[model samples]
Target: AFAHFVLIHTICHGAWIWHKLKPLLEALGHKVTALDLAASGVDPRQIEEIGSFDEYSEPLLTFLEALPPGEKVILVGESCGGLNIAIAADKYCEKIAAAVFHNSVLPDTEHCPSYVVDKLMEVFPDWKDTTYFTYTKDGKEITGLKLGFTLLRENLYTLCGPEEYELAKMLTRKGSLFQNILAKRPFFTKEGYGSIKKIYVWTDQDEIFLPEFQLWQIENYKPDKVYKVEGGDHKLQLTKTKEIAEILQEVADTYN
Candidate 1:
């Protein structure tokens, strides 16, 4: 039987972003679902309302807690979504068929990098133009933090064609800019998170997280499998939907 898949997306993006993948997976005879974190997606939760990482992830945590006993899901996380899945797999490893990370930032060594907060802060002063920052809408940057279009385009949509890039702009939202980047405590334990079947799908030509960084995480986490694709950026599903869907189907066929 085809397994169930639960997709988790990045900071500001919502469930709407998964529109392309859901039907594709369903057509392949697999069950598919996606959720927005508390402040993300179309949830309407304002960034100010989310004071902590836990608060932002309330929706995902609640979803996992509500899963019926004996019902398992193939959890897939993208970009910042990786951190949430790591915690999910840690607490609910038994409820997972496999945990997949797609060009996402995974837990490294003793802790998840809270360093990103400092990094973003470093560029905070220079962040003004709305077009430059994903947090901003018009020509001005939103009150909170957000990556600029330069970073988004350079690393996120480098491989996306012109039309796809435009769609990315339309779908982008004001993301959880701070807490999500902070370091998480009580990261992962061997018996807890390590026991789950974890997989990493590497995307070449990714500028956000270079191949070196992805490889480093793969080596540290030591996932059960590592799949690779070329000419795809961070949001590969947007630019390379067919290939991503096929790869996901393959993962289901071979592992599920």
Candidate 2:
């Protein structure tokens, strides 16, 4: 079955990261939409201007909200993008055919919105050259982060080629965890997010989102299906584009 695939990138990154995968999925007769979250890519908004996670996710939420009635699309998110998928699923479950967590933070309804991110910080505290800053947004201090070239090369793009790495360095922008906002947001609902089909695609070789955390997320709130890509890094869509495209095709066939 042909499917509509909406691709969501991790924080600090943007829709350009899926340049390779988007074309592949589209060539296979699937509709693909890759979006730049607020302040990421060339979205034009500064991190401080976006006061909440929902505001950062406005592009996605707006897209889903405007979808034609009865049209359901598959959401594919990488890294922190998983949290975006969960947020969308909670609000627009009926419009989502499935949610695919691609080497991402899989959030369960049992925990606070920041639970996975908090755990990720606990597991990987050393960000090397990555820098963090505090900015005032709406009279509240917000933490913003920028992925350093060293950390990107060593952890996130280990297996990717030089061109891909260079592109990332050029395009990456400062982003926020929205930890405080997420901490206060309600957990995903059973009738909403929990009702959609969920899948996970990851690699044990991911340096940033280590294997331990990925496995822990799976056990915490198991997905309907889990596809493990061997010898791939955190950016499997970049390192294993063909492989991920195949898995996504399978997901489209099985779920759609």
Candidate 3:
């Protein structure tokens, strides 16, 4: 059986982040759809225009909602994109073959939507030069952020090539955590999100999502499987593209 893969990028990143990995998955006889969440990538919407985490996630939700009946796709989320997968899975678990966390956050049903993100911020507090701003949504202040060149270089793109690094610097955009909204949103439902198969991929050398934090998430909400990459930064899709591709192929074969 072949698998259809839906790729989600992290905050401040667009679908462009999957440029290296998408083709590799396709070459393995899988179909891949990499999406640009609202306000990220080439999407015209601005961060201030997106009020809730659900709003920021509209693109992925819309894509999943449009799938033909009986068709299921594997959701692969990177970094904060893990939260995206959880949201989609909650609403469309039947359409998801598996949810893969690629050096990504792994949310659980027991906590609020902001649980994993809040924990992430606690462990990895210093964003180093990353810029932050606030926007009002329904008369309430919401936070938005953009990745700094230094943070990108040292933390996210350390193992990537100079051209790739430059491309990221040029294409990266501002994104919001929607922390307040997520705090208010209901926790993921057990029958919806918790019923789907889950997998996690990580690297020890990730500077942005520290090793300890990754392990903590795994312990917090155990996945069906966990695959650790030997060496790579947070953006393993760029740094270890082939290896990650192979792992995804394995996931498709096993889960489909």
TM-score of 2: 0.98
Q: How many residue pairs clash in each candidate?
A: 5, 0, 0
* lDDT-superior candidate, 1 or 2: 2
* Candidate 3: segments with Cα more than 4 A from true spot: none
* Model 3: residue 76 alpha-carbon error in angstroms: 0.4
Poorest 10 consecutive residues by lDDT, candidate 2: 82-91
TM of each candidate vs. truth = 0.82, 0.98, 0.98
Question: Can you tell me which runs of candidate 1 are displaced by over 4 Å?
Answer: 112-143, 177-181
1-256: candidate 2 lDDT, tens digit per residue: 7999999998899999999999999899999999999888889888889987888899999999999999999999999998888889888998998999899998888888899989999999999999999999877788999999999999999989999999988999999989988998888888888888999999999999998899988999988999999997999998899999999999999996
Off by over 4 Å in 2: none
The C-alpha RMSD in Å for every predicted model, in order, reads 5.1, 0.9, 0.9
Candidate 1 C-alpha lDDT tens digits along 62-178? 888899999888888887777677667667877888878888766643655454333334433344333322343323333455556666666677776777666667766665544
Instruction: Give the least accurate 10-residue stretch of model 3, judged by summed lDDT.
Output: 81-90
Residue pairs with clashing backbones, model 2 = none
Model 1 Cα displacement at 217 (Å)?
Answer: 1.3
Residue-level lDDT tens digits of model 3 in 10-54: 888899999999998888888999999999999999899988878
Error of 1 at 43 (Å): 0.4
Q: What is the lDDT of residue 196 in candidate 2?
A: 89
